[model samples]
Target: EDRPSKAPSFWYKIDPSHTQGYRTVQLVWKTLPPFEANGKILDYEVTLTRWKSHLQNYTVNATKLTVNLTNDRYLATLTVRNLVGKSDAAVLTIPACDFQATHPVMDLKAFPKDNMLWVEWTTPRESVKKYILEWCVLSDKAPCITDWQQEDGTVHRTYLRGNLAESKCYLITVTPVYADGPGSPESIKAYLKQAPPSKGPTVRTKKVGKNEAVLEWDQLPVDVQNGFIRNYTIFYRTIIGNETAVNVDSSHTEYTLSSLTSDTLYMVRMAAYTDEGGKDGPEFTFTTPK
Candidate 1:
């Protein structure tokens, strides 16, 4: 038999065995022009037959066709026969195609408290569709305790509360999810600890000459000290009514107050420090005798 002037195209594949015995196939082609010899364009019929252990046949009049290979796994043939003398045939094989799902990996860092505690992880390139962040206090042994109060999936870092108990430690963890469901593995747990509070320096103040005052204080702890004590601060105020206090940093322990009036009582306070740290000392009262 002579073939038609226009031929039809076919494309198909066998679904993975895990998906069951089903196979999907498709056919595509353009219509031929009207011919004087064939009269007018009439309707068309497409047939798909499978030859496995047994034989099954499916026929349709539409240009497109969908055949179910749920049972058979042998030779499946697609035939497109035009009302005209044109006809085409294509063969397809049914094979099992299986899809696998994989879990995503998470990375945790030992983030410092200076900024905040932050945990970061990337989703697996495989079948990962989304991510779920899970966290709990170290006290809670089981994951049953859900602390959604600080839980955030979008944020990579969390600003820890300053009120956190000093020297306290915490543990955090995260998990990834895929399109199929939650992944099997989780990221390694992370730990964090808070720093202790700082103790300020001690200060002391004393009166010297008629118009001069002396201020001194003990050095801070070796660990807390910054560097050399550049200078000392002396704060003095009048007890009468004026609440304003004057501050002065002098090279020597004693500083002269040239502008002060004679016979005026002044309240003095002092603090010492280096580049490291310092503390304020007790206050002293003195008068500028005439």
Candidate 2:
């Protein structure tokens, strides 16, 4: 129980060196949590293996390491150490060095499927071997942790392989992968599923007359409005229960109720609708004081 128990997740970056005809590799890994370290973590063990032969071994105390490896493919492995032993290896494959490109994917867009996000983009005018798609949840109360996937260069569109929760905003990015480095990234926000607002706006009598009353309400806030508002319907009735319904355009937040009986108490309520359904607001009452 005195050894690190989990492997670290990592990514790599390759850059051309200032010295001509050479490349530098940077390896960075996510830090292992203390719970994953059965004992206090002492350091990390890194190895670069080429053709089943160990080319270099290093003990690093930090989460990042950089080296100038020869221009060849290699398998890089990282392991955390504790009092007893080292943990399982976190591995990455390094690609051969090539020239870099600058252009990014164009016309990037995201669409919602049942439980997946479909992303598409126009190919850049650069030599791309593959594409990297990254996405993260957008929120004010939570951290923006990201996950990524790889796509073939030939494919221009693909659905993100995950079950997206309803009513959550996601920021997706597409980046072109050149043999030597990554191109610029283009990003957009999308939601995989939508619904009606969880709550509805409250209506109030802005002004009341003998036979007419103006009803007003605040529009639903963007966060609670699970989807775009299609329209708003106001329902009102007299004490005798003759209900009158009026459909108001979504752009307007107020409606005039006319031709009402004087000295009568009327009950009014409103519902905001999306493509899915609607949510009704609390009932309000007002008396015509003619």
Candidate 3:
């Protein structure tokens, strides 16, 4: 027996003709490779996760689906099922209630600073009457209801208003509204407040030599990475010697630790830091070859 090895890749667009009062979206995906399918693919499953509500699952043999999205934000999980089992989910961000804009916003930037979500963008060349800013918490437990505000076209930047949690992520969208209709929309992810990562990266050795060793680690999961990673620090020492530390930027995961004592039994540990603070991982031991 075999099963799907990968989730389905999909895309979505606004169905203007089908949407009346509420927005209708057309979701489409392509078939998987034989290796990814692994077996006779039974069908596809689409799970729509709302902000604070239950998940809605739909099974379809067709490659496309049209659903009316009342909420301003929704996250869809797409997966392919086979005779044996289902594949991992491919999560997607779906911004609803916005028209298929011809003139989308430009250079949009969003981030969390000082306990507020700051959203800024450049206006499109085409004339616009106003703008609609919408946002919602991204989660699967409940329905994601969007809170929106209409702002004058001249306003370029504003802070979102909501009871935003410190570590939870929110999907924010800015849409330009012309006199005739809505323009294109731009979206971003941000956090209201940030904290140190709950845990550090798990360190491992890539290569070791007489006087140096290459250390690598996997990035922390998004949920545990409470904030943007600032950097990584590795602490190591001999059994009876004082500890030495090295710091590296977040971009590089592998570091070559130099000036290490050969044939010495050393204990190593690592910490991942955010702007808020840092957390240490478990200690590991390694001895250089004699």
Candidate 4:
């Protein structure tokens, strides 16, 4: 054989396989190669490409051939300029990185009803390899991840639902996976409130003294009660298009319609209220005695 050509070895070490989306890689050589007479390396020229992985958007100069991270996945091209003219260009695929670190979900809000919890939040703003959500009772010392999701680089919101407890003390957390590794977990705490009862109360009616009548409603079902029955709303009017329709509230179970126009007829309906307002019951007609 005559003489073989000489070049620097091309190998590198990237830290933290997981990525928040930005990070650095060390320029290194696998083994020493045959060198020319004056074989000392001067410096390396580096170029970083974004998404397309073909467009060069950043350039850097480093003696050791190190590269800085960027906003997107990076395609790094490096060449060594030694005492010789130049070495062949080598390419390194590096994931995104951010020393700034990343937090979990934010601006979280929740609505808790009887045995139901509905939640939503905005996801983190940085690049993520993956994400996880976890929840538990307030007394839980350690909680396991309940769900995991990969980053599409675009989806920025999350929704969750779970069973609610009698008196809720919910603990929730969001964990982010970065190329650098798993970052800290973001957490939130919340208490729940019961929703308003959708169904109306049980009701009845009876004749009263002349010129008046009585309308009464039974208490709502215990489960449908939600909170406490604060009061009842009574809506009544004349069947003959009496423009004087009216609404009134009472803490008592019954209400008496007064100031009747002798034999004039009327109709009445009732709704009960808890901490959360209740719904209207059936309408009942009661004619006053002449």
Candidate 5:
């Protein structure tokens, strides 16, 4: 008769409601000789004794075990029988409630207000006890200042008010914390930049074939009479399905796109960049000649 071997004990939590119909548990341990040569095999069983007469038994072949709950119970336990040698017990606790915390939302927006630039964002989840706001003049540089506990109870909006220097750009981020600790992920960041007075850049397009088109755009001014232009991004969408588009970069003031299909129309737009971020311009449409 082959006796069961000793195995390491481990634990994990499971959401019975979210697990569909099955829950899997994995057991990890170093394999001993003999069984090590051919891979150790441990016979294990899970017994759920609830409501006295409603007893259930399960046999597991691998080190890991999975047990299904046919009936709802506040408590349950897994038992391993005939250990080859080791003696230890591991236990895991499951919460009674089925609800989990929701992810927080961070929306950042910036625009010119009067003589100053106003930066604002929506409040995160109500469960968040505190939040941290970080801002910097340059996106690549470290944040110069930070704000803490900006959420007053459930209030959802905060603003930074000041007369932003002409052509200056800024980046902002927000993080949420809960009773257990800080949330796993931060909210989406908001980027903004103030541009000097200039027409910016423009892109024009024409279709040359059924599968090809040509695009051209004006280059950025060497130096804006009032401010500076960093770069330009050309975005276009196709007429087929609603899929994400691509961005074409233009280092100079102008660029030409070649090899596009004819007879199809493409929606195109251009955006201006500063040290801070980017601002989208009006969208333009063009069709290739048949």
Candidate 6:
């Protein structure tokens, strides 16, 4: 009773794609004649073992088909059994049956300060000893400056600025490296510019009492506040608007005006001065009543 001797072939790894719970297995084989051409062939058998446990009676009686493999340690052995004899056995061993979230970097941010582009991040796990960083301005032919960096033993990345151009936006990615395995990464876009402010600050007039007013405003959007806000040139005229100069500290956000005539319409405009230059906004008109 001479039977055909054939083995099953395994190609490609078993992985669940697109958040799947199971992986599909393809078993390929040719004809395994148990006896002469006159004899009628029977079905084949597939045996499955999980976690080194030989499950009793856990055999599949199939006829040239695929198997649904779950995320687990598995062993598959295929054999053909007929009335005359059995065919050759094809075996496969699969290990590991689960997916886990990797520890990655967190809180990625980029800032512009002192004519430099700052890239910063924090790792979710403190166990990371090293980090890989890549930064480049986003362009069709932008070349990325790549390097491996180390956590400078500081609890923060406040000193991670680089000598990159402030005129273009740079893309940055930071990945954490752990002893166990490499983790995922985080990315962000950053840049600094030396151009004039896109628009003027929003100024408001608050009348405290007769002959007195307070000018308050929020700074321009940070992205447009390209230069340092050093001083503000206040222009005001009883008939309409710049008559006073003061040191508007970068930290201060409001200016108080006193000794103003009541029942008067005052048109006030402001010129915001920085290292780049001075930018003027629209004139805001308000009348103070006694």
- Report lDDT per candidate: 0.45, 0.81, 0.79, 0.55, 0.47, 0.59
Tens digits of lDDT, candidate 4, 169-281: 45666566555445467777554664456567655675565676676666665555555456777677778754444344545666667776667677777776656566777
- Model 6 misses residue 263 by how many Å? 4.0
lDDT of 3 by residue, 166-212 (tens): 77667898888665456768898777887888888899989988789
Candidate 1 lDDT over 246-285, as tens digits, reads 3445345444545565677877665555444444556777
Q: Would you estimate the TM-scores of all the predictions?
A: 0.26, 0.54, 0.60, 0.33, 0.32, 0.41
Off by over 4 Å in 3: 1-102, 111-115, 136-149, 179-182
RMSDs, each prediction?
24.1, 9.8, 17.5, 19.7, 18.1, 16.6
lDDT of 2 by residue, 110-206 (tens): 9886557899988888777677788887765577887766677787999987666777777898888765456778899877876887777799999
Q: How close is candidate 2 to the true structure, as a TM-score?
A: 0.54
Candidate 3's error at 220, in angstroms? 1.1
Q: Per-residue lDDT tens digits of candidate 5, residues 81-179? A: 443432233222222244243455466565555554454556664576554444555422344443222333354555553334455344455555454
Best-to-worst order by lDDT is: 2, 3, 6, 4, 5, 1
Best by lDDT: 2
Model 6, total clashes: 7
Q: Which residue pairs in candidate 1 have backbone atoms (N, alpha carbon, C) closer than 3 angstroms, thus clashing?
A: 4-86, 16-96, 16-97, 17-96, 201-278, 201-279, 202-279, 203-280, 203-281, 226-276
Global Cα lDDT for candidate 3: 0.79
Worst 10 contiguous positions by lDDT, candidate 3? 92-101
What's the TM for model 6?
Answer: 0.41
TM-score of 1: 0.26
CA lDDT of 85 in candidate 1?
Answer: 53
Total backbone collisions, model 4? 12
Question: lDDT of model 2 at residue 146?
Answer: 77
Poorest 10 consecutive residues by lDDT, candidate 1: 144-153
Poorly placed runs, candidate 2 (over 4 Å): 1-109, 124-134, 138-146, 150-153, 173-189, 210-212, 221-223, 258-262
Clashing pairs in 2: none
